[PDB]
Design a protein around this ligand. Structure first.
Ligand SMILES: Nc1ccc(/C=C/c2cc(Br)c(N)c(Br)c2)cc1
Ligand SMILES: Nc1ccc(/C=C/c2cc(Br)c(N)c(Br)c2)cc1
Lengths: 114, 114, 115, 115
């Protein structure tokens, strides 16, 4: 129900071995851990959740962009990239959060399909 | 060896049924037709060329963004989106040209892999 | 020393009246409110801070994109766009945080200059 | 009435000294040269045209991104970034064409205002 795809705009490649942490907003307004992983060789992270666990709510996808750039010997601007959104059942059922990274910039989009 | 992927930043979806025309630069500096198609339900166009035909050279991928927006009843800025690049054999072998469309803006990136 | 510029990729215009909240990470790892404002008719927000006040730290620039799209009567994907960065850690710099908004997407960039 | 602004997403800076060529589609469907220039230290190029000269038409703004990256001693993917649009077809407007550059990617947006 939830996939993350990360691309590198400097090298023209998937962004491999990027740490990604997903959080769900709790009733007290704290962010609690939900799912995490490292992007694959294809820059993707699948297997984060199941339909059962992925209930409506506010989620945060934190992509560790600073460590990614540092590992490539490149000095970056951001601490991380943050994508915060509401999962809504009246919308399509599969969510892809994509991000396109540069050292001083990033783009993100959502592809929400049925 | 060549794929095109198009996404819609307004609807959060693949951009479906978008016309895409590929041209190769000729020795006289004219653009000659090379391959074309319409994006699928997943916003992708595969099958454009084969490894045999996709030789080094300068290529232009023209995405008919104006017709796409007009069909959705939305007034857009650009006539089309143009992506012009050199295919180089000393680089990885598969090229994905991706574009992310808005009415007054677009993003494009290349994912070049082995 | 800190400016925010926001554009609307749907309308081809500045994004006007966008609320922006800036936080600074405190000693105790919480996010302290630092400054806030709204973009002008030119999509710009200046006057957030001074070079005295804008010390080294980890800053969070929260751009209230959902409130923007909903005030336009549109239902967008993101809650906000957050831009988090270390500032002034090699001395004072001037920062422009720019963002380009669509209902299901945004991009952000930084322009950092040394006065 | 026509301005071009270019930023560098690698350095977090204006993209300076970027060559830009503007064309206008002629009666015979060819691309006639219209104006050209280079971005300044602020990544901006003004003074391309006048409101008299900038008549209705289909215009092509070619940003020479490959020459930029190669002058920096970097090998980029694209030959250039081309921005093609109809202008002034409901009367005169002011156009800003902005671009944000990386070696394998770019984004472009337009800001259109009615003076
Ligand atoms: N499988 C597959 C391959 C490539 C993509 C490209 C996504 C994409 C994301 C962002 Br954000 C921008 N700005 C751009 Br241009 C493109 C998606 C799925
Ligand atoms: N004066 C001034 C300063 C900064 C800007 C930024 C424009 C801008 C263009 C793109 Br294309 C993207 N993707 C992003 Br983000 C931002 C414009 C005018």
């Amino acid at each position: 129900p939830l996939m993350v795809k990360v691309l590198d705009a400097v090298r023209g490649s998937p962004a491999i071995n990027v740490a990604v942490h997903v959080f769900r907003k709790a009733a007290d307004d704290t962010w609690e851990p939900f799912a995490s992983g490292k992007t694959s060789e294809s820059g993707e992270l699948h297997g984060l959740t199941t339909e059962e666990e992925f209930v409506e709510g506010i989620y945060k996808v934190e992509i560790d962009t600073k460590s990614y750039w540092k590992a490539l010997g490149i000095s970056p601007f951001h601490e991380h990239a943050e994508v915060v959104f509401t999962a809504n059942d009246s919308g399509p059922r599969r969510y892809t959060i994509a991000a396109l990274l540069s050292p001083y910039s990033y783009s993100t989009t959502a592809v929400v399909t049925n």
